[PDB]
Each structure stands twice: as structure tokens, then as C-alpha cells.
Amino acid sequence: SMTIQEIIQQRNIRSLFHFTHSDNLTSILDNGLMSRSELDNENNEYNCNDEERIDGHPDAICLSVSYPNAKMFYKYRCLKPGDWVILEINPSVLWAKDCAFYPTNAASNNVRFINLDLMKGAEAFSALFSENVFGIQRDVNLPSEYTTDVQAAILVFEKIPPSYIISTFHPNKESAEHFKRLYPQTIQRYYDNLNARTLYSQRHYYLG
DNA sequence: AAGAC
Ligand SMILES: NC(=O)c1ccc[n+]([C@@H]2C[C@H](COP(=O)(O)OP(=O)(O)OC[C@H]3O[C@@H](n4cnc5c(N)ncnc54)[C@H](O)[C@@H]3O)[C@@H](O)[C@H]2O)c1
């Protein structure tokens, strides 16, 4: 029975991602990622996206494996103007923190009723890579590090200190340079042309 | 290209 670590090694996973509005980035680089619950209790300021939290876990931080939830991400970029960024996170989070693993969006009826304890552990992690996820047939050519369903989600039930953030992606040079001046020990990356295959792209295009 | 109920 493979461990989470052995799955990461075997599939060549190198990145977890979390998209967020640039308005949140100072707070995140200072204090780490925190759940909506934990943000409320510390009276910290945040711009959140989800009004509903149908997942039912406002004490969880939501990540992606290898590629953002491009669908949900694009939606919220349309609804909220200004610069969005993408945090890249050490895959170590998956074993070092209290994670649940969901093969599709964690708010989906297909998964959200299951005993949360069954969604922890290497068995649930491996299901992100199944040949069929609730009707999505995994493409034979999809590289091993990608989830079958682009909306596959990691719910992290504790804070993620800023040291687990390995880089941040910006939509323009000036955003990256602003945050680099503030956090000179950190890696701040950017795209010069967004007419390109970028982490802001739909995945089918990115991998095309 | 626009989640989830
Ligand atoms: N953000 C993602 O990459 C992502 C990925 C996969 C799924 N989701 C789903 C969408 C939904 C949660 O929506 P989401 O948009 O993430 O809202 P949310 O309810 O978690 O809102 C929290 C917001 O606060 C932000 N935040 C975290 N730590 C801090 C901090 N220290 N200072 C300031 N802000 C902070 C975080 O980036 C996010 O925008 C769940 O149902 C998930 O299942 C989101």
C-alpha cells in the first residue's frame, strides 16, 4: 500500500497551487495560509470568493495538485477585477499537514457526504488519479502528475506557514517586482505575455 | 474559459 510520499515520487508531482487575489498576498506571505474560520477568529482582513462554503469545511484551506482549479479560478477573475496570483506550495504539505483528498470539487454532491476520515490517507490521494472520476475519463496522454479532474481538491485542516510557499506567480512584471521588494528572500515569478500557456489558462489548453 | 447547492 503506497504512501502519499511514494505516490508523489512515482507521479513526479512537484507543485501544489492556491489561487488568491493580490489583495491577500501581503497577509499570506507574512502569516501563512489560514482557513476562513481561523481568519475570522483572528479578526484578519481577507477577500474570499466562496459565499456558501458548500464543502462544509470553513476550517480548511483549499489547494490543487499540479494545476489550479482553472474553472473556478477563471470565474472569480471575471467577478473580481485586479491582479490575481497563484501560490506554489511544497507537496510536503500533503503528508506533513492534516489533509483530505477529493477527486473532484470538495463542494460536489459526488464526494461531500462521505465520512471525512475516509478522505484522509493514501487511498483517497490515489483516487485523484483514477481512470474515471464521476464521468471524467482520464486521457491516456495526461501526464502522471495531473489529477483526472482539474477540480480535484486538497482540504488542509491546519494553517500553512509561509515557508511551505515555494514561489508566487504574478500576471505582470510590476506585480511581481512590488512583492519582491517587500519580500526579497522569496521567489516572485511573472509572465510577460498572458497570450500564452500559463497557470491562468484552462488546463486542456495548457497541456495542448 | 464562469464551481459548488
Ligand atoms: N483557492 C484555491 O486555489 C481553491 C482551489 C481548489 C478549490 N477551491 C474551493 C473553493 C471553496 C473555497 O473558496 P476560496 O475562493 O478558496 O475561498 P475561502 O473561503 O477559503 O476564502 C479564503 C480566502 O482567504 C485567503 N487567505 C488565506 N490565508 C489568508 C491570510 N493569511 N490573509 C489573507 N487572506 C488569506 C485565501 O487565499 C482565499 O482567497 C471551497 O469550496 C474549495 O472546495 C479553492
Author numbering: 0 to 207
Sentences from the paper on this structure:
Modification of nucleic acids by ADP-ribosylation is catalyzed by various ADP-ribosyltransferases, including the DarT enzyme. Using structural and biochemical approaches, we show that DarT1-NADAR is a TA system for reversible ADP-ribosylation of guanosine bases. DarT1 evolved the ability to link ADP-ribose to the guanine amino group, which is specifically hydrolyzed by NADAR.
To confirm and characterize DarT1-catalyzed guanine ADP-ribosylation, we determined the structures of full-length E. coli C7 DarT1E152A in its pre- and post-reaction states. Co-crystallization of E. coli C7 DarT1E152A with NAD+ as well as with carba-NAD+, a non-hydrolyzable NAD+ analog, and an ssDNA 5-mer allowed insights into the substrate-bound state of DarT1, while co-crystallization with NAD+ and the ssDNA 5-mer gave a structure at 1.63 Å of the product-bound state. The interplay of key residues in the active site for catalyzing the reaction is enabled by their proximity, allowing coordination of the guanosine, the NAM moiety, and the distal ribose, which promote NAD+ polarization, NAM-ribose bond cleavage, and generation of an oxocarbenium ion intermediate. Of particular note is that comparison of DarT1 in the carba-NAD+:DNA-bound state with the ADPr-DNA-bound state revealed that the side-chain flexibility of R51 in DarT2 could not be observed in DarT1. The corresponding arginine residue in DarT1 (R52) hydrogen bonds in all captured states to the β-phosphate and is furthermore ideally hydrogen-bonded by D54, indicating their interplay for catalysis.
